[PDB]
Symmetry: D2
Subunit: 352 residues, 4 copies
Amino acid sequence: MKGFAMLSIGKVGWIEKEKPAPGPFDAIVRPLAVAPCTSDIHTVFEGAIGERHNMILGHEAVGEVVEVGSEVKDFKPGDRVVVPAITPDWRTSEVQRGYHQHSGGMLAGWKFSNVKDGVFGEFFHVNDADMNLAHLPKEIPLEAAVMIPDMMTTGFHGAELADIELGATVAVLGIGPVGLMAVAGAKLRGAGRIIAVGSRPVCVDAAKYYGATDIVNYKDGPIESQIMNLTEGKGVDAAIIAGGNADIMATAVKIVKPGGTIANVNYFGEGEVLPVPRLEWGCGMAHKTIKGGLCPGGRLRMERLIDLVFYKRVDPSKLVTHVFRGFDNIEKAFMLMKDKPKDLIKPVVILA
Amino acid sequence: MKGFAMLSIGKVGWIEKEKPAPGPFDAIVRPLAVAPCTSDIHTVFEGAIGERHNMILGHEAVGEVVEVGSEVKDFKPGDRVVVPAITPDWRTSEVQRGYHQHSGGMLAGWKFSNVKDGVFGEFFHVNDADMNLAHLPKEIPLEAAVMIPDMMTTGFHGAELADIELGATVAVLGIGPVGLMAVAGAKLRGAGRIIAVGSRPVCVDAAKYYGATDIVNYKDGPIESQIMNLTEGKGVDAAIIAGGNADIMATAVKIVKPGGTIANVNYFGEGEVLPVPRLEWGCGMAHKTIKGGLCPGGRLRMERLIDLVFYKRVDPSKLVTHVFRGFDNIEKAFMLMKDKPKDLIKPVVILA
Amino acid sequence: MKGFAMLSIGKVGWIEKEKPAPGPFDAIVRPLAVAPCTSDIHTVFEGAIGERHNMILGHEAVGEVVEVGSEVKDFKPGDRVVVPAITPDWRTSEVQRGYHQHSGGMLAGWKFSNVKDGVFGEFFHVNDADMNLAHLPKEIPLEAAVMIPDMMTTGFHGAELADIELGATVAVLGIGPVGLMAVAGAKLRGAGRIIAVGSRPVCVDAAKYYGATDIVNYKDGPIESQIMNLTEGKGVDAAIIAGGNADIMATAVKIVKPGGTIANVNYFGEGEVLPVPRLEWGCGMAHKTIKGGLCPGGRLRMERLIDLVFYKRVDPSKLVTHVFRGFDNIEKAFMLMKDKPKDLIKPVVILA
Amino acid sequence: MKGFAMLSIGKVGWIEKEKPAPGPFDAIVRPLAVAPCTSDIHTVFEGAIGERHNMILGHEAVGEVVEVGSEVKDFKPGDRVVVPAITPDWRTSEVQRGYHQHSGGMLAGWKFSNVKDGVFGEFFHVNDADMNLAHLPKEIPLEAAVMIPDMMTTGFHGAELADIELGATVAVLGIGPVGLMAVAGAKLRGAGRIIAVGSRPVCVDAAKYYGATDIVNYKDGPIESQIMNLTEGKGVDAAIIAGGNADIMATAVKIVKPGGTIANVNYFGEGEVLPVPRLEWGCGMAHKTIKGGLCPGGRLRMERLIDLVFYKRVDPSKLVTHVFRGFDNIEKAFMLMKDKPKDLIKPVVILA
Ligand SMILES: NC(=O)c1ccc[n+]([C@@H]2O[C@H](COP(=O)([O-])OP(=O)(O)OC[C@H]3OC(n4cnc5c(N)ncnc54)[C@H](OP(=O)(O)O)[C@@H]3O)[C@@H](O)[C@H]2O)c1
Ligand SMILES: NC(=O)c1ccc[n+]([C@@H]2O[C@H](COP(=O)([O-])OP(=O)(O)OC[C@H]3OC(n4cnc5c(N)ncnc54)[C@H](OP(=O)(O)O)[C@@H]3O)[C@@H](O)[C@H]2O)c1
Ligand SMILES: NC(=O)c1ccc[n+]([C@@H]2O[C@H](COP(=O)([O-])OP(=O)(O)OC[C@H]3OC(n4cnc5c(N)ncnc54)[C@H](OP(=O)(O)O)[C@@H]3O)[C@@H](O)[C@H]2O)c1
Ligand SMILES: NC(=O)c1ccc[n+]([C@@H]2O[C@H](COP(=O)([O-])OP(=O)(O)OC[C@H]3OC(n4cnc5c(N)ncnc54)[C@H](OP(=O)(O)O)[C@@H]3O)[C@@H](O)[C@H]2O)c1
Ligand SMILES: [Zn+2]
Ligand SMILES: [Zn+2]
Ligand SMILES: [Zn+2]
Ligand SMILES: [Zn+2]
C-alpha cells in the first residue's frame, strides 16, 4: 500500500506499507476526497507532538467502506461515509464523564496523523465503525462534505463553548478555514453583530458571506484598540480564538466584558505559557470564563452536521479555493498548505 | 384622554380617563404604532384573568417619549423607543433569583392590559424607563418594530427553553404569529429539520419562509401519528407548543424522544389540568423535561432583538398582513382579531 | 440452577434454570447479599410492565465474580463487586447523546427483572463487566453496600434533577427508602431547610437522621395547605417526588414557587395521565420545570457513590431494618415487602 | 465621626469624618462586630488598587440599623442585620445580564474599602437597603455571623464555580479562612475525597474539621508531584484556588484531569500575567475550564447562607481564633492580620 507520510521531523515523503485489517468492530475505508490542514504542518516541521517515523498524515476525508469486521451491523462495503477526524474508543471512564475527545487520555480521541496512520493512503483504518461513521447523502458534493470531518466541527464547537445568547455580539479572532466556520457557527447560535479579525482578502470576503458584520485588520492598529472603539468601550459578549500566537489570549481577555466567555479552538504550537492579563482579568475575579477544547467527533456529531448542510443551513463549499485530481496531488496540496499563498483557504484532492 | 378599554367581561368600548403622570424613574409615551393580541381576547371575553373595569387594553407598541421623571437619565422627550410587553420592577428578590418575569409575583412582570392600563390610549405609563425602554433605530420600519415587544420575544423564548443543539430536529405545534417566530427562533439556535403544525394557508407560507422544512396539517390525520411517521419512529429532539388546547400537551410528550425537551409558550385559557401521558412519560422516568414560561422583557432583551432585525438576521414584517391608519381603527383591528378571518396573521395600526 | 421468579402475573415461586455463560465482555456473578424493591411488586402483581414467564426477580445485589469473558481486563474471579441495577449497552446512539439509561430504547438501561433474569438466583449475568462493575472496598459492610445499586443512586438522582442551590429549601414527597436517600441527597447538594412528607414513624426518625428539618404528615390535613403555611405562603425552591399516587404531581406543582423545579424519581404504576394544574402552572408560563428520570448506572456512578460512603459522607445502613440469612429467606423478604409491615423500611438477605 | 482609615499607600491611622446621611433607598448602620481581611493589606501596603486618601477600611461586619431613607420598607432602626461585602446597584445592564458583582463596571459591586468608606467607623453607609441587607436571627452568635459577609460567600462561590458532581474528588489550593470555607463548600456540593494544600497546623486542623480527607504540605515536595501520586496519576475532577502566587495557576492546570474545572477565588495582587502551561492545557484543547470571580452579594445571597448556618449545615465559628473587645482594638486586629502569627486564622472585634 502506498501513502504520503512523515519520515521524521522536517522530512516528508511517500512510503510503502501493508494494508491494515479490521477487527470485529472496525472498518477499512478508501479515500474518495481528502484535504490537508495546518495541524500536520505544526507536527511535521515544528515537531509540536514529539517525533514520529513513517506515519501517514491527514485526518480529513470522505470515502467508501471497503471491508468491515464481523460485528459491524450498520455499514456494508460500498457505502459512502463521512469520517470524523476524532474517532474515540467509546468504552472508557472519560466517555461516562461526558468527554469522548479525551477517551483514553488527554487528546486521545484524535488518532489520525497522531497515534495512528492518517488518511493520505490508499486505505485507512477506522475503529468502532457503528460508532464513528456516518452515511453521506448523495446530494452533498464531495468537496463540501470533506469540510465536515474537522473544519466545521471545530469552528462550530467554538461557538458552542462561547455560550452565545440571542442577539449577543461575538468577536472571532483569526479567520482561517476554522475561523470562518466559527463565524457561521456564531450566526447559527443567534449572534447579532459578528466582528471578524483577519487580513488576507480571500478570508475577508468569505467572512462577510458567512455572517461577519465588521472586519478588523491587524495593520490599521492594535486589535483591542480597534474593537473597543467599535463597541463604544462596551466590549464584546464572547470571543472565539481561531488563530494567532500565544499573545492572542491576552487580547481576548482584554476585549470581553466582565461575565463574558472566551472560547478557544486554536492549537497553540509554540510558547511555554499562555498569558492571562492580571488587571484585565479583574485580578482573578472579572467572571471572564476561559475555555478551550478539542472538536467533537463520532457518528452522532457527523450526522447532525450533515443535516445542517442537507437542509441548507450552511454551505461549506466556499472554503474550497483549490481542487486537485489524483492521488499524486496529495503532496502538492500539502506543500501548498505549508507556503500559504495569499489566495488559499482550503485545498481539496479528489481521488475518484 | 381617550382610550379603548374593557368595560366588563364580554363588553368592550371607548372610554375617557385622566392622562397619567410619571414618577422620578418613569416615563409617559404616546403610541406611534400598535397591535392587538389574542391575549386580550381571552381576558375580555373568556374572563381568563378575573374581571376588570374600564381597563385600557393592548401591550404591543412603539412610540415616542412625551415626558420623563426627574431621575430618567437615558431617555429624553422626542426619542423613539420600543416598549416591551413585560415591564418588571427591577428591585425584588425574584430579580436576584433571575426571574424578572415574576418580579413581585407569578406573572407580575406583565403589567399592561392586566394590572395596568394598556397601550390603546393617547398615552400610556412606563415604569423604570432606563430599565424598560430601548431606542429604536430609524432604519427599522414601524410595522416590523411593533413585532418585537411580544411576538418575537415570546417565540424566541420557546426556542431558548427547548435546549436546541446544532442539527437537532424541532417540532413547532401551532403556527400563529407566535408559532412563526418560534420557527424563526429554532433556525437561529441551529436547528436542522423543523416541522410546523398548522392549517391556514397564510400561516403555512409564512412558516416555510421562516425555516419550516415540513408542514403537518391536523386534518390529514392525528398529529402524533403523522410526525412519528415522518421521523421513522424516532421522534423529535424538541417540541415547542405555540398554540392549541389542553390536550396538545399530551401530543407533545408523545412525539419527543427520551431525554428531549418540551417548551411551552402558549397561554392556556381553558381546562382545569393539563394531561401528561403516564406511559409516554415513561411512568415518570423518560427524562422528558417540560418547561413553560412568560416571555422576557426589559431594555436588554429589546436591544438584542433589535440588533437581530438591524443586522438582517430576522425579518418580522412578513407577520403583518393588515395595516390600518388612525386611532379609531384600533377598535376595528381588535374585532378583526376576535373573528379570525382565514387570511389574518397579525394586524397593525399606525397612529402617526 | 435455582432462583426465585415470576411465573405469571400474580403468581411467584421457585424455579429451575440453566446457569448462564458469559460472552467475551460479560461476567457471571454470585450474590453475597440481596434486597427486594417495590418495583418487583408492581410488575408481578399489578402487571405494570406487560407479562413475563419464569423470569427471576430482583435488581439489587453485591457479590463476587465467578467467571469472566476473554476480553474482561479489569475484573478477575474472586473479586467482590457492587452491581448497578442499571446495566446499559455502552455502544448506542443514546450513549452518544448522553442518556445511557435509555441505551437501546426507553428504560432499556434497566435489564434485571425486566428483560433479563434478576439477582434472586444462585448466579446472574452482567453485561459489559469493565463498564458496569465496581470493586467493593472491604471496609464497607455488605448490608450498607447493597443500598448503593438502586436506592442511593435513585434518591441522589432526584436531588441532582432538582437543580438545588446553596441554601435553597427543598420538599421531599414520600419518605420510603428512596425518599430517605433523596433527603440525604438534598443535604449533599447544599440544601438548607428540608421538609419531608410521610407518616410511618420508622421513616420519620430516619428522615430526621438524614437531614429533614420539618416533617409533614398527610393526616393533619392536605399537604399543599400545610407546606404553604410552613413557608409563609412563599413555597419551596424545589420538590422531589419519591412516592405517592398520580395526584401527587398536582400537589408538587402547587407548592413550588415560580421558576422552581419539580424532580420525579417515583415509578407511577397506575393511572392514564398525570395531572398538571393549569392555574398553578401559570397557564403554561410559571417557569416551573418538571423532570423525571431513571436512575443512573454503570461503573463510574457506583465508584463515586462508593467514595461517598467510604469517606463517611453518607451512611445507608440506617435503611436496613431487617436482615435475614440464607437463600431460602429471599421468598420471605419478598413477601414482607408486599404486605408492608409498619416497621419496615428495607430488608436485606445475606447469602454468605 | 471616628474611623480607622488608609491615609496613603503604606500609611494607616485613625481619622475624623462627617457622619453620612442616607438617600431615600439607603440606610446607615453601626458596627456590632467587625473583622479584617487580607484584601485591605494588599490595597494599603502593596497599593494593588491605585491610591486612596483617608478612606476608611474593612468590609465585613454585622450591626444594627440606625436610620433609613424614606423609601426603605423592609428595615427599621434597631433591626440587627448582616451586611454583604458586595453591595451592588441593582439597576444596571450587568444586572439584567446576570452579573451583579460587576454592576457598573469590573468589580464595581465591591464598594466598601475600595470606592466607598469601609466598616471600620462608628457608622457606615449601605446603598439599597431592601436589596442589600438581611435580618440576622438572634440565635446566631455574632462572631460566627461576621464570617458570612465575605469569607463564607467567597469560599462557597469557589465550590459553585467548580461544577462539582456527587462523589467527585476536589483539591483546594490554599487553606486560609477562605480556603477552609471552600473545603466546607465542596462537601456541601457532594464532593467525596477532598484534598487540602497548606502548612500552618492551625489551618490543618480546621481543614480536617470542615471535611478535608487528605492534607498536602508544600515542604515535603512539589504540590503537583504529591497530588498526582495520591490519585494514582488520575488527577482531580476540580481544583479551587484559594491562595498562593501567580504560579499556583500552572499547578492547578497540571493536576486537573482533562474536562475538569479550575475555579479561582484568590485575589492576585502581584505579577503581570498568570501562566497557563501550554502542554498541560493540551495545547489549548484539554477541555480544562478556567474560571475566576468576585463573590456574590445582595440580600438573597445572605439570607440563604444564614439558613445554612441556622439549620446547622455549617459552623463558621471555628474560623475565629481571636476575639477582641472595643473600637480601639480594630487597629490591633488589623496589624495582627498583617504580621500573620502562626496561630491566626481570623480575628474578630466585638464593638458592643
Ligand atoms: N487538531 C485539530 O483537529 C484542529 C482542528 C481545527 C483547528 N485546529 C487548529 O486551530 C488553528 C486553526 O487554523 P486554520 O486551519 O483556521 O488556519 P490559519 O490560516 O492558520 O488561520 C489563522 C487565522 O488567524 C490569523 N492570524 C495570524 N496572526 C494573527 C494575529 N497576530 N492576530 C490575529 N489573527 C492572526 C490569520 O490571518 P490571515 O490568514 O488573514 O493573515 C488567519 O485568519 C490551527 O492552529 C489548527 O492547527 C486544530
Ligand atoms: N401573555 C403574553 O404576553 C403572550 C405572548 C405570546 C403568546 N401568548 C399566548 O400563546 C398563544 C399564541 O397564539 P398566537 O398569538 O400565535 O395565535 P393563534 O392564531 O391563536 O395560534 C394558534 C396556532 O395553533 C393552532 N391550533 C389550533 N388548534 C390546534 C390543534 N388542535 N392542534 C395543533 N394546532 C392547533 C392554529 O392553527 P390555524 O391557525 O392554522 O388553524 C395556529 O397555527 C396564545 O394563547 C397567546 O395568548 C401570550
Ligand atoms: N425502577 C427503579 O429502579 C426504581 C428505583 C427507585 C425507586 N423506584 C420507584 O419509586 C418509588 C419509590 O418507593 P420506595 O421504594 O421509596 O418505597 P415506598 O414505601 O413505596 O415509598 C412511598 C413513600 O411515599 C408515601 N405516600 C403514600 N401515599 C402518599 C400520599 N398520598 N402523599 C404523600 N406521600 C405518600 C409513603 O408514606 P408512608 O410509607 O409513611 O405511609 C412513603 O413515605 C416506587 O414506586 C419505586 O417503584 C423505581
Ligand atoms: N475581594 C474580596 O472580597 C475577597 C474575598 C475573599 C478572598 N479574597 C482573596 O483571596 C485570597 C484569600 O486569602 P485568605 O483570606 O483565605 O488568607 P491567606 O492566609 O492569605 O490564605 C493563603 C492560603 O494559601 C497559602 N499559600 C501560600 N503560598 C502558597 C503556595 N505557594 N502554594 C500553596 N498554598 C500557598 C497559605 O498557607 P499557610 O497559611 O498554611 O502558609 C494559606 O493556606 C486573598 O488574596 C484575598 O485577598 C478576596
Ligand atoms: Zn484538522
Ligand atoms: Zn400578547
Ligand atoms: Zn428499583
Ligand atoms: Zn473581604
